């Protein structure tokens, strides 16, 4: 009965395509045609964080908008005070092949992971005055690409084994497993209310999942290559993806289809990271061309360029209060832009 | 800058000192990436991620084995070399080996990384050629029109074995020279899973790679 199932799947795909087409009464460009342009945005490098002796792979801001954790290929996880450029902590790692890091919203823990297939959770605020490995979460059969905290006890990890996992830290067991991607899951983004989350993979596909039910609620397919970065809109109703297609795309969850495409003929390099500003008007995307572009999220016009890095911009993030943007690159330097 | 801020700055300076010491001690080891198939016999070349350390002439080598897309290959764009192991005795899977070698050679993050190619299991290749039960012509037609160029070890030399092994090497060397552009080189070697010179071969090839990099950097060649 394989052929009958294939025909039914094709019919369902056609039905979904027709449903998405029916809802497209007008485009975002015809609605924001009359909104005022942002203008030229010129952000300067306020502080340059030095101390990493290898490529920087990930950074994550703390919820206080002052402390940030960065991960480097030299086996180091460094916690910085951004205002004074003071190294608050330096954590050695058992594996130097790190691809992700996370900062708990409470600030008590940090997360790390990579080619060892293990999410290591380190406890910062402890007696004895030294950071210790609180937990090692194992169970993924591939490398860890991204990890995000929900609280001090729940963590969501994305892996290269095509799956995602919701772990209870105290028990150490996968409370939920998310399956459905046919390729390597590269990025993960938690919703502001922390009930849904989106994951982009190397299928040129992004999936919207429900944490409590464990099922895939939606699938978005607009890209032509691997989706390397994904980020939620501040209101939790839309999200942006960046691919190796040298293209970003803004998708809407309630319309269940793509809203906008950010692309330029002079851009032929992949997109490593994307992020939104506090109001959602700006979209900051990092590239392999050694710089970052600031797009007007409503008009698809490139509002500005941040061009201070001497190698591939591997990570970028925006503080919760929207004051500063941190970019980390392969030149072993983090930069703060305001 | 209060007293607590001064103490925090002193703590940061101590952290910087420790980081510098750790980086200096880490930058004394040559990192290598081991690649191959299940039939290759990669783990017998010398002596998540498996790491093997060895030392030749007071130089420390650290090899990493992970495990087709290889998205993680970007992590190894700064390694000294890639050690690619091929089972040259398997004529059925040799085209897969050639395709994998071509994929690794033309990777955009590996454009400046040389490859030390080990054509492994020469005992089995010799037995297959001398037995005559399997023929390379059944898989690579051009072997019918191939002549041995002029060069081979004497202790047990047989023209058919030499011709077969030189053809198998020439396939990979042609893949290498198609788009090498001089940025990186391929170093082909023949092994038998009983030799003890593989560490020496990697040592010599790494010395050659570093010599070429120094020639380019120091504005000599």
């Amino acid at each position: 009965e394989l052929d009958q199932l294939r025909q039914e799947a094709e019919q369902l795909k056609n039905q979904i395509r027709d449903a998405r087409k029916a809802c497209a009464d007008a485009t975002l460009s015809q609605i924001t045609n009359n909104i005022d342009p942002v203008g030229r945005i010129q952000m300067r490098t306020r502080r340059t964080l030095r101390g990493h002796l290898a490529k920087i792979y990930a950074m994550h801001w703390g919820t206080d908008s002052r402390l940030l954790v960065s991960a480097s290929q030299d086996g180091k996880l460094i916690i910085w005070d951004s205002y004074t450029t003071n190294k608050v902590h330096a954590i050695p790692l058992r594996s130097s092949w790190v691809m992700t890091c996370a900062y708990a919203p409470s600030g008590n823990y940090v997360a790390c992971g990579g080619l060892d297939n293990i999410c290591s959770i380190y406890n910062l605020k402890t007696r004895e005055g030294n950071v210790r490995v609180s937990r090692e979460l194992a169970g993924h059969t591939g490398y860890l690409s991204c990890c995000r905290f929900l609280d001090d006890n729940q963590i969501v990890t994305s892996s290269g084994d095509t799956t995602c996992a919701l772990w209870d830290i105290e028990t150490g067991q996968q409370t939920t497993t998310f399956t459905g991607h046919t390729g390597d899951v590269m990025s993960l983004s938690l919703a502001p209310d922390t009930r849904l989350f989106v994951s982009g993979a190397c299928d040129a596909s992004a999936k919207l999942w429900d944490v409590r039910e464990g099922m895939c609620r939606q699938t978005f397919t607009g890209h032509e290559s691997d989706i390397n970065a994904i980020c939620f809109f501040p209101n939790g109703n839309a999200f942006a993806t960046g691919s190796d297609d040298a293209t970003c795309r803004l998708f809407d969850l309630r319309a269940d289809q793509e809203l906008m495409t950010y692309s330029h003929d002079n851009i032929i390099c992949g997109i490593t990271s994307v992020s939104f500003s506090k109001s959602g008007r700006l979209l900051l995307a990092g590239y392999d061309d050694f710089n970052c572009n600031v797009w007007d999220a409503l008009k698809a016009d490139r509002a500005g360029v941040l061009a201070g890095h001497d190698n591939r911009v591997s990570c970028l993030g925006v503080t919760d209060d929207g004051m500063a943007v941190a970019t980390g690159s392969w030149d072993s330097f983090l930069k703060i832009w305001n | 800058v209060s007293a607590e801020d001064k103490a925090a700055a002193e703590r940061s300076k101590m952290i910087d000192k420790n980081l510098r010491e750790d980086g200096e001690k880490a930058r004394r080891t040559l990192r290598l990436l081991l690649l191959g198939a299940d039939n290759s016999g990669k783990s017998t070349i010398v002596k998540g991620i498996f790491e093997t350390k060895f030392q030749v002439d007071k130089v420390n080598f650290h090899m990493f084995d992970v495990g087709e897309r290889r998205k993680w290959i970007q992590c190894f764009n700064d390694v000294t070399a890639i050690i690619f192991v091929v089972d040259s005795s398997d004529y059925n899977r040799l085209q897969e080996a050639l395709n994998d070698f071509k994929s690794i050679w033309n990777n955009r993050w590996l454009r400046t990384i040389s490859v030390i190619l080990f054509l492994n299991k020469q005992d089995l290749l010799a037995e297959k050629v001398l037995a005559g039960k399997s023929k390379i012509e059944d898989y690579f037609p051009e072997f019918a029109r191939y002549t041995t160029p002029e060069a081979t070890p004497e202790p047990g030399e047989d023209p058919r074995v030499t011709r077969a092994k030189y053809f198998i090497r020439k396939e990979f060397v042609d893949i290498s020279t198609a788009s090498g552009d001089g940025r990186h080189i391929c170093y082909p070697h023949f092994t038998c899973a009983v030799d003890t010179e593989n560490a020496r071969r990697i040592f010599n090839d790494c010395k050659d790679i570093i010599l070429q990099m120094n020639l380019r950097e120091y504005n000599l060649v």
Partner: single-chain antibody
Amino acid sequence: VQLVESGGGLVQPGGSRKLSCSASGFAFSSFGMHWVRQAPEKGLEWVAYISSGSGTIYYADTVKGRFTISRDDPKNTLFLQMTSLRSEDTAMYYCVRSIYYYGSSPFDFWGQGTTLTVSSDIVMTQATSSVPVPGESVSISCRSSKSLLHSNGNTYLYWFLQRPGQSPQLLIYRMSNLASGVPDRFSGSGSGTAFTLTISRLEAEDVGVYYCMQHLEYPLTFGAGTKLEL
């Protein structure tokens, strides 16, 4: 975590003695260390400080030139060599660990001190020496001669409690932050040169002497100490 003092005893004036503190249960090399002395019937007085790595060493003016503070990190030991001992050096000496980074809690642990018997500064003022109090709110006020609010937003004021027969323990750091292990009924409030520690629903085991200390500049100065009594 444990800090054990040793040495002490009765000495003649003009002599010398070395006090020692053995550290256990924590990474001693990452902590700065303080020697703080208390006279037999008086308040706390800061004596000396040595930074992590022995980079910075500070001495109080009353002991500068006679006391030497040192540390042996491999042996996890802290030493105070006292020469030219005077009658005013008769006191109980405490060793205090103190780590400094963004969000740290300095002066968090104190050791049970050792007794020694011999035969420009910011002045911290505590309004009352005694106030009688089970189940009622108690407000302890403190003042400084100089504003403790730094330009970086921090108000460097600390509240300690010393129970009878015990070494003082940290209650509040930077005028609002509750120390780890301290019940939430303690609160701290105030502006520059005006500080208040509020104890809501006072219980037993909360009776002792309360000290306000400034960490804005050296030398570190304590208040006289407010005593609660039942």
